[PDB]
Symmetry: C5
Subunit: 346 residues, 5 copies
């Protein structure tokens, strides 16, 4: 018989009247495109720009009655992408592209196959840099929902309807891990149908839930801030009433708590609200600032001067150095109970 590209040239080129500019089912029902993606790569989830780079295989399936061949014996006629500008294709785009490209190495990475009843599979490889707003109210313990939405640009709802398929509409690669987050297996598949003054346009989207990994900030942020709070508690044991060394232990633990507070937001967006790492690095700034403020209470009370009055202010200098020695591991530990149970209920 005929070779299939030449068999398909008479199905398209100038003898069958196939016009690649005019959609199937024209002057009738709209085209029902059913979509599913395959995430090869995921990640580089920046928060300064609030975006993430995904790498998908975008599969699209629609029906074209004009491509319904009826006397070739096989079931799937493929097509190399040189003659892929000769069929109708849906004008899908992404509402939050922020730059995206195809992949054109050794061949344009595209796929086409045409079934006997005109079912057209069409798979392209796309790298997207998708925008998602970061809600950083509880910053190391937040579940980010970053989405991607697939709209139509030139055709309204009575021309082209996007759907997800029901056979697992978002697949994910086999060992797809992330350095900072983990990807949850529940992916919401819902509609996002838009409206403009141009009209209404179809839209489908897929939410991706991105639970963080708390195990990094529990090494850089929370534990070296925990040691400086213990370091200020050395000053209650130093020289048993007062010293010039307790000043320098009260100065320095405020410095590398302030510098570490400024280093807790080194590569973050400049959000207006106050977040979970901002109410840990500022309350523990208060425990190391009150330790030198504790010494200013000792060095002013104990340096005051009958024969009875000598032992009355040193006894007010030991009680301030044996209550504050135990009350600071009481106020700090009850904050430690209040901080993490609040961010487990949330």
């Amino acid at each position: 018989p005929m070779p299939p590209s030449e068999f398909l040239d008479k199905l398209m080129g100038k003898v069958s009247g196939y016009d690649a500019r005019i959609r199937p089912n024209f002057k009738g029902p709209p085209v029902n495109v059913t979509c599913n993606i395959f995430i090869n790569s995921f990640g580089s989830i920046a928060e300064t720009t609030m975006d993430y780079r995904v790498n998908i295989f975008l599969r699209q399936q629609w029906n074209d009655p004009r491509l319904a061949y009826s006397e070739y014996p096989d079931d799937s006629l493929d097509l190399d992408p040189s003659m892929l500008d000769s069929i109708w294709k849906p004008d899908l785009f992404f509402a939050n592209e922020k730059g995206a490209n195809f992949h054109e190495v050794t061949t344009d990475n595209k796929l086409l196959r045409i079934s006997k009843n005109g079912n057209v599979l069409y798979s392209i490889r796309i790298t997207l840099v998708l925008a998602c707003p970061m809600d950083l109210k509880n910053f190391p313990m937040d579940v980010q929902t970053c989405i991607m939405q697939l709209e139509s640009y030139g055709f309204t709802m009575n021309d082209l309807i996007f759907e997800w398929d029901e056979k697992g509409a978002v697949q994910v690669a086999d060992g797809l891990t992330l350095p900072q987050f983990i990807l949850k297996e529940e992916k919401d598949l819902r509609y996002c149908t838009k409206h403009y003054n141009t009209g209404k346009f179809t839209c489908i989207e897929a939410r991706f839930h991105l639970e963080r990994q708390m195990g990094y900030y529990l090494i850089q942020m929370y534990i070296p801030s925990l040691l400086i709070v213990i370091l200020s508690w050395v000053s209650f044991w130093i020289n048993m009433d007062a010293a010039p060394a307790r000043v320098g232990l009260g100065i320095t633990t405020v410095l590398t708590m302030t510098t570490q507070s400024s280093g807790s937001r080194a590569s973050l967006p400049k959000v207006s609200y106050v977040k979970a790492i901002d109410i840990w690095m500022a309350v523990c700034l208060l425990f190391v600032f009150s330790a030198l403020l504790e010494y200013a209470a000792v060095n002013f009370i104990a340096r005051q001067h009958v024969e009875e009055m000598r032992k009355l202010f040193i006894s007010r200098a030991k009680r301030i150095d044996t209550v504050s020695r135990v009350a600071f591991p009481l106020v700090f530990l009850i904050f430690n109970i209040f901080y993490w149970i609040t961010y487990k209920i949330i």
Copy 2:
């Protein structure tokens, strides 16, 4: 009847004499293009480069009498962007482009429709990186007006006239938020008509007012600078006349006020003038520098030595340590009144 692209091929291609190089209403009135944009994304407003990245849907509407079909029954003939190089289009550009691109993922993201009387809607998706000059005289409390202006390049005022439409000429996406600024709902829509030695060229523009979010600099810049000013006031309570510890408390609070002053302009343009964060981080540098300068007044007066003269310089060492203990929370708090009321009237 005819399919619409084939119906439009005889309206354009070589049988109707439609030349895509020659504007409508030729040798007559100029073409009245009416424009409106739709901001999908906004932000990444850098100040080192003084620019911002917007993502718009640029809609244009003009009238073409040559496209006035009169016997097709519908009201809107669309066109896929393959045959969009076959009509006349206005040569709109942006006077402050600084790099811009189209969006060509899965289809060139363009729109066309032609009404019965020749009204042509034309919508393209553009990512712009628009230049705006930053007036940073009062830096965390400024209202930036960053603009975008839409000129004509090859055609003068007697050939092509840009207008905004009256039905909401700048729309904004639904939940369009910003990390650092907030976008005000009042957008000025005015003319910017240019003049060269080539002639005069039409221009329309849209001002965008960008009020900041003070809630970030009120966490990193103003509060850790507030604590160091309190930290120098510890030195008035330390050892009740003088100490070697009051030197190290007078040295160190100048260091991490100077280092924090140099860190208050880490990612800013190198402007010549003096700004609001520069008159807070330098006046509070003076409160922590005068505290060690207060100790140089104590340690020189009190270390001077009849039997009357012993109690005359210690009484000049307590008065300097009980006036300065209260006058510094008087001079600093009256600066705190003077600083923020000045930047609320402005």
Copy 3:
């Protein structure tokens, strides 16, 4: 006779029926493409992005019976890449591209030659930025296996089969060195055959083992952390019972151990687990934190006060200053034995 391009124009163009869209051995056995690469450049192995940039010469060899010329006297007809869009080529791609490009300087850097029996060599120059997951559990002493895999996109296993050849399927350039790693000469050449809902697709890959160079982190990370642990041991010799100087030697060696701990992960991914440089910079943080905690045991015991009791607490102040003077070079050196022998067995 004929010039070879004109001799090949009648072998391809419209007189021989050679269709560049239809694979050889059609309706028969699949095409057996045999591949081998030549690594010109290698490196820029980033860990923030977890990728690496390679520069290869991708050679492909398949058989085309339609190109079997039989009366030209030579053995290898080449072809400049202008008429290289006129033959069939396999649609090889890389499953972890993350951006890649050709090289088109002074000529498209491509090669073609056609043997007498239709054997087609095809060599192109590609720059790849290949993704590989970093397993950083033992960070300066890990052997990274970063791969690259060569799939087919549009053709299944019954259409196109990739193979490596047996004559050294991965060559490497002559003096190809790396700044941070070294490349091992054993390269695994195995199959990675994929499966989708589209079907199954061929895949071959090549593992690259990248042993690090420990000699850099043995200069910046481990030795300046070794000196601060020695620096805290000065405090056992300072003023022979206690001093205000031993406080400042116990404060400061915790600071530049904490700051150096935060600088041990300056340009690394934010992984959740705990790595080899994280259990060196935190255990040696404990040796410099226990030195000031040793002084808090001295300054509280020795400052307590019959005539017998005066020499009983100073003898408990020398024993704590002659056991701890030797036990800390015992506990630290047995950790030094335990740390490096663990990472030589692994």
Copy 4:
């Protein structure tokens, strides 16, 4: 009559013999192209790369006798840039391009008009990243002359001659300001005619003088270096002969003078010579290093020990503490006179 593009198609296309490959005035005088630019944007003047990004409207005017229409009634036939590859255009380039691009948003931003005698105006919008060598001998007080030069590539002096016009050959936009520099209104317009082994080629250029804004480095560099020099002068008033506090005031003001010296060249090229900020941050490093060296003269002389000899070394400890208290605001202020008057004569 005829529409003008169709009137110009018979002036160019295959009936008039107009060849777009062969210059006007051929086998005669060379083509006299007269140029003028319009700077829309200017800036991002980096010094690490030693370049600057300009955005110009490059206007070119030459004479083509083959385009001299003689029976159309108007005076200026324009042309949309689709048929702009059909006329002769000069092969102007920039000798210091370092990357440059056109602007192709919504239309290729080009202009053409043809007068009745064949005068051809041609305006394109270009973004350039032009290289200029930075002479940083006196770094905050230098006048940089960064140039741009417009050569011919394929045609020698007997084929194509570039000129500036006399009606303001370099215009500048209306409110074109800069963050770091200011642009002087005097722009030199001179020749730069090149010579190779290929021959000699025409060249015109325009110098741009870029005076800096001293008001930034007078806030970050010179004033916080001025305060540390005052901070070392506290040590002459501290404890009136000697102290352990004067050591820590002599140590620390060398540290944050050295760290501030290393931060005075954070984002600069690594030039070999010594610049104006390098002889301020090193001489003021000597005033804070001699202050601790002053204490080493006090603490060695005054700690030496008949009944006459007790008051003879303390009188050599007050004279060294009342000469050096006044001589350092004498040597530093005469350096302050010598530093700025030297950089006002230059």
Copy 5:
């Protein structure tokens, strides 16, 4: 006579049989291409990536007997680059491209001219980012030889032979200076002929010797490290036996020697070996670490306690403070002799 492009159209297009796919001197001697470059710009020599960006005019000269016109009166027929895809051109590439581009501003920056005997000059402007391995064993005093090599891709030695010409095969622009290096005038011009399993391919290259400028690291690295070594020598004059101030002068000069050591490799590749700035910043780390280790010898010997024994340990506390006061400017200055004479012989 004929216009030259039309005179050259009959020399190339379909009447002379000139095939642009088939090299000159076919079935005979190979094509002898003679090359020479002209370096316009040079620099941005990064060491993290180990590459450098050059901007060349690549001239190529070969002989084509098919272009030997014999009845046109002139000597050099040029050609605008529109019809430059119509001649044979050599497939030169660079073996270490790492990304490169042409320059296509206002015209494709290309040149062609054809002499009467068929000599073809061909000059293109290229920006290269060429890879070179950095040998940083003696880092501020090394002579880097960074190369560039010009290979053939599709043609072997019996088809196409590259040569340098003898009339100055590498020219350099007039005032081509560098910020960090200087370019030596001796440039080696030698062969680099490659061999693969494809065959052997021609190659020519040009070594560029890049001597550094020592005058930058002699300001940031060596002199502020020289002052800290002098700063530790203050401690021998402080309080004449021992002090708590000599501890803080022995602590701090180890800190900002360690921090300055970590800042001596801020923007360098992470090489395994030990370099010249690594044996200066570590030996001078030993002079400031032995100064506090000198105090631990004083404070333990001098604090030991008959009537004879009182003056026997203070005399062992002055001898350790008058030998070490002079021996450290003896051991450091003999290292200063040993360090720089070693790196002048090399």
